[PDB]
Scaffold this active site. Structure first.
Site, PDB file in Angstrom:
ATOM      1  N   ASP A 291       0.663  -1.104   0.002  1.00  0.00           N
ATOM      2  CA  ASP A 291      -0.243   0.011   0.094  1.00  0.00           C
ATOM      3  C   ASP A 291       0.721   1.423   0.067  1.00  0.00           C
ATOM      4  OD1 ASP A 291      -2.697   1.191   0.581  1.00  0.00           O
ATOM      5  OD2 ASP A 291      -1.470   2.227   2.230  1.00  0.00           O
TER       6      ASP A 291
ATOM      7  N   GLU B 271       1.019  -1.161  -5.275  1.00  0.00           N
ATOM      8  CA  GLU B 271      -0.003  -0.149  -5.562  1.00  0.00           C
ATOM      9  C   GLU B 271       0.502   1.054  -5.680  1.00  0.00           C
ATOM     10  OE1 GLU B 271      -1.974   1.827  -2.531  1.00  0.00           O
ATOM     11  OE2 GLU B 271      -3.693   2.734  -3.736  1.00  0.00           O
TER      12      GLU B 271
END
Ligand code: NA
Length: 628
Positions: free
Chosen positions: A286, A328
């Site tokens: 993330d 990501e």
């Protein structure tokens, strides 16, 4: 810099002479020792490029290696077999047999025990990969959908216990499904113990975050920082109750971790090992772009960020080889691809293809999509794209302005059109989305809404079902691991209550985070309903993808269709795919098809198609032709 052999002798110093002799002869030590010699050089090089001659580097590294050994020693035997399997099969991520799905445990199945009961459905659908949204403890009320972590080890009590999570992972593996979870390593919630202790002045947590006495530095940094959630706060900082300012790239309750402190890397590496030993197969990295800051820069995609991720990769190659990373990075295309590599993130989201699929539905012109598939699709060996249509987040128009300019398209003007179109503020639009983070100072804006809402299914547009089929067909066949946003396979619409929920009303992303729709899932086998039509068509494409070797791998070559409304590409020089993005019939001329076989089987419709004559596609029709 210390070498692997030397460091290993120190790892063993915790054992008495008698115990040490036994450890040195053990199979676990043999494997750990081998992997250390092979991968430690990379770990050392990456850490040195970031920390240099920092006094804490050596002590931190030795502590990390000691933990890595204990972690590997403890690692379950079944997971160790997967470690070996993947060490010798780096391309498992590129197999056409892979198809993934993503869902929120609470929204889709209530809790972890409920999720376990949904596994038979995942097998029915054909999934081999399942990403479960943030599962650990987080602030009550507002936590950015679980992305503000208050504890990396304690499971959100509403979902169950860590024991329930172990059972779920075990059950997924038994069903032939890999478990995928988030590694939220750029920040923690402001309620996390580390944050509380750092802010309180506890020496053990000194410099774990970026805290300033006033606006002097924050103002300087803000000269170059991009605002992610401008609605929440300006720039990248938030003020504490005592007057100080803390770096908060995202919500104010998410404090950015300070990787310029080697002890922070060690702390997060420890968390990664914890997740690895639960049996996690892939960790979604993330916010990878934001892990390194430097005054005068955008504090995005910096060299040290890439180095740190490569360091984390090396830790897994040493202590848990089966664990892969999914990047990501929703940034400029030139930057997105830099995170993908066998030694960094083996796979990563492909936002460019996703954004351009939606762009093409709006404009009816495949120009940008064709360009992207021609010049930005193929990746280095042993890596793959994660191709998707929708996610838990808004849609950002991250195509390259430079690429668009080459086609005579103005990025800024074009995004204005796309935003108006998808939020139903453009004459004739079939989309029913909602705005997300309109920034008055920049003119930028993103779009929220489910796939079904964006194609016109809410108002029963006769083309809606076919649009969904077309979009997913491309993510399923271009090459890479396709990810289905669970709920899309039955045409789930936007959530009906979020806009009036005080904990969600200021975050439109909740519009596309609806709950499991019992009614729609109960209609998935009825061909006369939208749900049944969407489900059976997607299931069919999944079945074809997984059984037909022509879809294997991640490479493709585009085919010039000579029709601005039809995209075309070839997989393994054996599968010719055509996709009509117009709501009207479109033709690929016989002249254009002269070099193709006279006849070819279409895997989508099942009929034999003649290619020695004009080929006319119905509105939104997709064809998967076997040309070899
Ligand atoms: Na000793």
């Amino acid at each position: 810099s210390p070498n692997s052999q030397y460091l290993k002798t120190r790892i063993l110093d915790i054992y008495t002479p008698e115990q040490r002799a036994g450890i040195e002869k053990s199979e676990d030590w043999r494997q750990f020792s081998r992997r250390m010699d092979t991968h430690f050089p990379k770990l050392m090089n990456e850490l040195d490029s970031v920390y240099g001659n920092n006094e804490a580097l050596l002590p931190m590294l030795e502590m990390l290696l000691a933990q890595a050994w204990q972690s590997y020693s403890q690692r379950n035997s079944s997971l160790k077999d997967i470690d070996i399997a993947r060490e010798n099969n780096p391309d498992w991520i590129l197999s056409n047999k892979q198809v993934g799905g993503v869902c929120y445990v609470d929204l889709f199945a209530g809790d972890l025990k409920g999720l376990k009961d949904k596994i038979p459905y995942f097998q029915e659908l054909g999934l081999t990969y399942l990403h479960l949204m943030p599962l650990f403890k987080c602030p009550e009320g507002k936590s950015d959908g679980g992305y503000a972590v208050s504890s990396y080890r304690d499971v959100n009590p509403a979902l169950g216990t860590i024991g329930d999570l172990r059972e779920v992972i075990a059950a997924l593996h038994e069903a032939g499904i890999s478990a995928v979870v988030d590694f939220i390593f750029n920040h923690t919630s402001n309620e996390h113990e580390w944050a509380q202790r750092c802010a309180a002045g506890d020496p053990l947590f000194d410099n774990f975050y970026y805290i300033f006495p006033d606006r002097r530095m924050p103002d300087q940094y803000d000269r170059t920082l991009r605002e992610i959630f401008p609605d929440q706060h300006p720039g990248g900082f938030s003020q504490l109750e005592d007057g100080r300012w803390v770096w908060t790239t995202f919500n104010s309750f998410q404090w950015d971790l300070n990787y310029s402190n080697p002890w922070v890397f060690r702390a997060m590496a420890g968390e990664m090992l914890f997740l690895a030993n639960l049996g996690v197969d892939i960790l979604r990295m993330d916010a990878v772009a934001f892990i390194w800051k430097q005054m005068g820069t955008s504090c995005e995609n910096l060299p040290q960020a890439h180095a740190l991720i490569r360091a984390f990769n090396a830790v897994m190659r040493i202590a848990a080889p089966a664990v892969f990373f999914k990047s990501e990075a929703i940034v400029h295309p030139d930057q997105v691809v830099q995170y993908i590599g066998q030694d960094e993130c083996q796979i990563g989201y492909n936002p460019l293809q996703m954004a351009l699929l939606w762009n093409t539905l709006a404009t009816r012109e495949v120009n940008l999509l064709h360009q992207a598939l021609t010049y930005r699709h193929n990746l280095p060996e042993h890596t793959a794209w994660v191709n998707y249509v929708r996610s838990h987040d808004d849609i950002g128009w991250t195509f390259a302005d430079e690429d668009a300019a080459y086609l005579g398209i103005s990025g800024y003007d074009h995004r204005q059109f796309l935003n108006r179109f998808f939020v139903n503020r453009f004459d004739g639009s079939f989309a029913r989305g909602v705005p997300f983070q309109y920034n008055p100072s920049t003119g930028d804006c993103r779009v929220s809404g489910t796939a079904a809402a964006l194609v016109g299914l809410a108002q029963d547009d006769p083309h809606a079902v076919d649009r969904i089929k077309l979009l997913y067909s491309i993510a399923l066949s271009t090459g890479g691991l396709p990810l289905i946003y669970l709920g899309d396979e039955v045409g789930t619409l936007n959530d009906d209550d979020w806009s009036q929920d005080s904990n969600k009303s200021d975050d439109s992303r909740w519009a596309h985070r609806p709950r499991y729709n019992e009614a729609l899932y109960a209609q998935r086998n009825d061909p006369s309903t939208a749900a049944g039509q969407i489900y059976q068509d997607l299931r069919h494409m999944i079945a074809v993808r997984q059984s037909n070797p022509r879809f294997d791998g991640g490479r493709l070559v585009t085919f010039n269709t000579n029709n601005k409304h039809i995209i075309g590409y070839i997989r393994n020089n054996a599968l010719l795919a055509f996709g009509n993005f117009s709501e009207y019939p479109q033709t690929v001329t016989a002249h254009t098809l002269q070099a193709m076989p006279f006849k070819a089987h279409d895997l989508i419709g099942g009929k034999t198609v003649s290619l020695n004559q004009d080929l006319t596609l119905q509105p939104y029709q997709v064809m998967w032709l076997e040309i070899a």
